[PDB]
Design a protein around this ligand. Structure first.
Ligand SMILES: Nc1ncnc2c1ncn2[C@@H]1O[C@H](COP(=O)(O)OP(=O)(O)O)[C@@H](O)[C@H]1O
Ligand SMILES: Nc1ncnc2c1ncn2[C@@H]1O[C@H](COP(=O)(O)OP(=O)(O)O)[C@@H](O)[C@H]1O
Ligand SMILES: Nc1ncnc2c1ncn2[C@@H]1O[C@H](COP(=O)(O)OP(=O)(O)O)[C@@H](O)[C@H]1O
Lengths: 545, 545, 545, 86
């Protein structure tokens, strides 16, 4: 609290500092041969090689430093929370490109840098591999991410390879035994749950199992302003349309606030003739993206309704009571018995969503838009698997659950978005490609040389792609011969790396080292903006207002 | 005097420091637009832009620093003491290549660097231009080095252009008038002078003028061990061979020490019959490279003699007394009247030396061997010119003499070794050439890529050639447009620079900016070794034994 | 002795500092109303308003500061040593233009500044007034420079006004009485004096008076190498040409060294027949600019001779013995009796020098070339006046001598180079003129605006001319009315100032305040270069080698 | 003095760009006053503000100057600072 206002020379000196510190800390941990960090938390010691853990938990003393650290860290942290891998890499690059931006100042050059990298990005996007569940490489992918588990990879790759035609959704529970236990099902998890514990079996948040129902999907959030539209709705269907109705009447909506939940408790007490074994004939169901409720509507033959007052204006055309089988829960509800008349309607609805993705742009196929729409498909079609993980102690079971979850996250994103060749190669080929493409095309080579090659950027960026490769393999067998390394054309055609586990030398394709497409893309994408930011900042404020 | 022994991390940290300081100090002064230094010497202020002065006179506080400074400085200082220009440049490069050596460690790489640069050196050696006295560019050369004197350049270029067929030797004296004064002669200066003041006219180191003599050239250094060989020699010629002898008998040798000079004073007193007007008939003559006395022998019809005892065994075949005209002096002797019978013998002797240079290697044509042999030619053939420089005060005459001496040094080395295109261009072309030559030749491109291009050196060395060009023109008209500069093929073909005097833009060939070949070669040559040294040193000792 | 090497930010910060200090010290002293400085010298106190004294004697503590001070000071000091006035002014401006150079950086702008000021300089050179001895303003000039002496001005202006047709040369001696005493003569001082005290009357450096002689002017410096050419010369004239010869034979030359003076002492002893009353018949005469001896030659009918050996080859055509009257002295020789046959030859020689000045350029008319040639004219033609200054004490006589010498220096340069209008006006008109001239001329106004007006320099330079006027009159009657001052066209036509002595307000032409042309020119000229230097310096060295 | 001050905004925006590189600094001649040339910082091209599409609301740059004045004055004419909590 000397000065709360930092301008200029100073600010960047600090940014440089911090960035350099973090880099050292985290990059040390990269790969299987990476060295370890010890972390205090009160009275204990986590000792790790998880860059993300390291990164998340690195702290500093001066407010200034921290201020900047946060900016380096949160983006790396933000990769694993959606992708599942690739923070270190992000950081490494964040250093890489920063340094770069600093070598070529002037607010035309920064513009030029961006475009170049952006084109490189697209080259990565194109280089994307694809994999079906049958393929053997899913093993090798699962093997990489499981830090060399000969047991897990085998199991999980069989899971996906045996169900050829359905994508298995997988859950995890902490088991009791030394052995694992697998529970395969043919139903799908639904995101709906009780609004109030009273509406369940036994009137206290239990698990009500049903063999008949009539669902109705409302969109609006429900509170004290809807209590009247509900009384008009409920008594209109129970009086007029009671003939064609299997109990219970499920009222699925966005949110049920407590003023409307107490109204529907008394509407259950209003008709005690329709109470069978304690089960209330009306259950309100909330959900945590409007079209996710449209999926809930399609699975259960329920119509979609915008307003609560629309419950009145209905007919045998719009009311459809199902005689399947449903298991409601406080956490989530589960469907099981699906008559093949329904499986035609859900499969038709899923084809409608798939056709929307078929005519997406290639860049939008890695957006959140597409990834949510595929999260819809797998709710609609797929097989629920419950694995109960075990082991010799308590902590080793809990750790083994995490190692499984890593595996699933890897495998899903593997077949979903393909895979690139490992050992920091893919990036090198991409850069050297992108340079060669624009320089080779006679049309624009005019300006291309002038912007990138002539100014010297191209050459700088080429050396930067190398970094990952340098970090992994500096001080090994590969790099010993010939002083440093010779990234010639011969190498570009057949890139040679070292498997750090084994010790042998070969192609990443040969040896079985692959990174998820989505990671090393997001890494670079993320790397750029965050680099830029640090580079173009000229001021730090620490003043609590 | 904390520690007298510096090893490692420290030593180089220091070397870096110093080198960086010096560079800043000196490079600031480069070109006509360079900024100024003020220097104390006791109670005064020299304010300058002379890099050499700056360099020579920069001091430091810690013994350590100085230790290193000396090593940077003395080589730069050593360029002007033989070439006459090019210290700054040397230093700039000394930084340049240092920095380089540091980027590529490993004692194969340093080897590779050397070879590359060496090849570049040869490319400079080849790029060498040539100039005859008639050519207009000698003006433009003289104009550059005279810091834009429209008067001096004109005069001195006329001097060399009017005597087409003889290379004028030029001396300088501090004059009396506001105007200069020129004294043209047709004689040649000889490096011989009195051993003792007694042997002159008036017996006190005066200027004896003669119209007849008989010279004898001895090789050995003469002291107390030769006093007897002289008495046997002198009386053998004065008794036996007095008929065919014109006085005085000149005894030219290397050194006459005082034990032999007093012997020949009494040998003059021994025959007082041969004393005409006070003039002693015997004069010993010393000279400050054995074959320089062979030139003295050829000009004067004197024979060459290895020993002092050889003076006895002589005949009319070996004794030849000249009837020309000679002016002996305490500083130097001067010849004037040369009978066309002698001018055939000297011209034949000069052709013998020229033929030795005709079949020299191109690299040996810039050695000391060739340069001394051409210093022989110009003693033998050429016209002595005495210029007496004047002006309005005392200090401005003395300064004007120096400016003239700069001009002569420039012009001589200009026609002697040619000239390269200025503005730090020549170096750029050479590098880009040398890279393109070896990479283009299909024979060895195999290894060439592997050593220089692939490792990245080539690219580093290319950026380094630029430095001179960057320093001169950064922050001007030329460099404003397009952020920085674009050293494309188009530029290599027609290199554009800025004349800092005028402001206009064009080729160095067009605008009239030329550097002596010998300088920018010696600069680079010197740059390399001295760079290496600083780079490869790992220890500093300060201990007075 | 912390650091002996100062680069950059620092160096200029220091230069700024010093310059600012000096300025304050000296500028405080400008004009009659200026405040006083007290100076220590050991054990006393000089208290003054003499800027030059102040300037010369200001000292500093850090070597650095001093280093720079010297550079500011010596040029100011150098004005009074040739002009006699105008140091403060110089300094003021040295600040002024410095400051300016700093506002417009970039090494085109500095070039532009120079040219502008240079044109301004020429406008001053043109504005030059002229004055004949008769004119009343010489009084007013003499009055200004004599710090308001109603007695001195009157006397000295009468001296020059009474001798209308001859420019009086004036000397000064410290008198005995309370009253002054004037000694008018019709002879001219000559710069020749005894080489040795032996050659005088009484043989001990006395004042030999003569009524007949035969002079001979030699050019060369005479030493041990001329002793023989003298014995051949002297005995050739005393033997062959003794008939047409009046004694003594005066041998006027540049320098007589002691080896030749002892030769001519014995040549006087060689012919004792020609010794009359002790007077040696041969006197060597030395002089401290070759053509000053040509003046000595023309006054005395002596021929000019280049060599000492030329004394032999002479005839009645070349030897001419005068029967005038001469008074030789150890300090200087004096001529008196001049036959009207001689006064035709000297007056013809003086017309020859005047005609060389008639066709000089206007810029070269203020050079050293012209000023030395006029120092020749006044040696040749003019009246010697010896004033013996007195007063009540010792120190007040010595001070009164200095006040007289100021007066003469002023008056001579007044009629010699004219006079400009005072109170720092002339400079203002010049600037405002030079701006208006180039801007008004339709031919080049194109570029003129672009260089000077458009960039803003012109306006800056205008405000700077004001400074002198501001310093003199800020905090007075003139500047009280209207906040500050309004340099309108009306003012430019009729410039109003304040006489600081009286208090009244009027034109400098009206009130009688005039500066010598040569001063305020040299001030500005000097101001510029020295300003530039300080501005363009980027380095300070303090290291004793 | 006031003329040089109007420039400031223009100087700040475009110092160290394409426009200001040529001719040392800038030449606010009559020719410029008639057809004022600026640089669009988004694109990089050079032209009139009318041509390129760069416009400020009237109310702002008025209130700016209006506000600028009084607040300038105040700071300039103040000669005293009190910090004493009563
Ligand atoms: N067994 C292996 N052999 C060779 N390279 C490997 C191996 N395992 C990982 N790599 C390489 O090292 C990197 C793994 O680092 P990791 O710390 O898991 O990355 P992040 O924490 O950023 O997800 C990947 O870029 C991969 O190409
Ligand atoms: N008038 C000019 N115009 C353009 N370039 C010049 C001019 N004069 C010199 N140069 C360039 O600048 C350098 C001169 O620096 P200088 O200090 O004289 O070198 P050094 O002290 O090393 O001899 C040369 O390399 C030359 O090419
Ligand atoms: N009596 C006076 N009235 C008005 N102005 C004067 C008077 N005397 C001198 N000045 C002005 O003041 C300056 C005299 O300063 P001075 O210290 O004598 O100059 P310097 O020391 O540079 O010769 C001159 O420029 C002159 O114009």
């Amino acid at each position: 609290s000397q000065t709360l206002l930092v301008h200029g020379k100073d600010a960047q000196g600090i940014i440089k500092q911090v960035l350099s510190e973090v880099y050292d800390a985290v990059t040390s941990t990269m790969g299987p041969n990476g060295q370890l960090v010890m972390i205090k938390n009160g009275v204990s010691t986590k000792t790790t090689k998880d860059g993300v853990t390291v990164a998340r938990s690195i702290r500093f003393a001066d407010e200034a430093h921290e201020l900047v650290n946060r900016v380096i860290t949160e983006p790396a942290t933000k990769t694993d929370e959606e992708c599942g891998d690739g923070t270190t890499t992000t950081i490494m690059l964040t250093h890489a490109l920063y340094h770069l931006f600093k070598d070529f100042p002037g607010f035309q050059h920064h513009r030029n840098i961006e475009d170049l990298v952006e084109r490189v990005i697209q080259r990565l996007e194109s280089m994307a591999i694809r994999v079906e569940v049958d393929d053997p490489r899913l093993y090798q992918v699962a093997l990489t991410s499981s830090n060399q588990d000969e047991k897990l990879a085998r199991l999980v790759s069989e899971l996906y390879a045996n169900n050829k035609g359905s994508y298995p959704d997988i859950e995890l529970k902490e088991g009791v035994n030394f052995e694992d236990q697998i529970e395969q099902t043919t139903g799908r998890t639904i995101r709906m749950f009780y609004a109030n514990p009273w509406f369940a079996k036994g009137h206290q948040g239990g698990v009500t199992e049903l063999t008949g129902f009539t669902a109705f999907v409302i969109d609006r959030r429900i509170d004290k302003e809807d209590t009247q539209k509900l009384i008009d709705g409920v008594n209109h269907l129970v009086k007029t349309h009671k003939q064609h109705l299997a109990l219970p009447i499920l009222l699925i909506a966005r949110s049920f606030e407590e003023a409307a939940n107490s109204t529907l408790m008394q509407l259950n007490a209003a008709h005690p003739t329709l109470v069978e074994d304690g089960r209330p004939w009306l259950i309100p169901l909330s959900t945590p993206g409007t079209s996710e409720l449209q999926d809930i509507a399609v699975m259960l033959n329920a119509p979609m309704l915008s307003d609560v007052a629309d419950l009145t204006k209905l007919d045998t055309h719009s009311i459809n009571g199902q005689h399947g089988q449903l298991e409601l829960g406080g956490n989530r509800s589960i469907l099981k018995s699906t008559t093949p008349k329904d499986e035609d309607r859900i499969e038709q609805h899923a084809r409608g969503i798939e056709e929307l993705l078929e005519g997406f742009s290639l860049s939008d196929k890695f957006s959140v838009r597409a990834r949510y729409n595929e999260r819809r498909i797998r709710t609609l079609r797929g097989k629920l698997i419950t694995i109960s993980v075990g082991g010799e102690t308590y902590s080793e079971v809990k750790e083994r659950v995490d190692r499984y979850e890593d595996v699933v996250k890897a495998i899903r994103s593997a077949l979903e978005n393909g895979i690139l060749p490992g050992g920091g190669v893919s990036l090198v080929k991409a850069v050297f490609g992108t340079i060669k493409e624009g320089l080779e095309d006679k049309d624009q080579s005019a300006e291309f040389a002038k912007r990138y090659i002539n100014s010297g950027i191209a050459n700088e960026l080429m050396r930067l792609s190398t970094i990952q490769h340098k970090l992994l393999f500096k001080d090994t067998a590969l790099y010993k011969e010939n002083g440093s390394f010779h990234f010639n054309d011969d190498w570009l055609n057949t890139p040679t790396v070292m498997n750090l586990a084994t010790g042998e030398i070969g192609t990443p394709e040969g040896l079985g080292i692959y990174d998820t497409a989505y990671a090393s893309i997001t890494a670079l994408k993320g790397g750029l903006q965050t680099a830029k930011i640090l580079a173009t900042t000229k001021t730090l404020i620490l003043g609590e207002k």
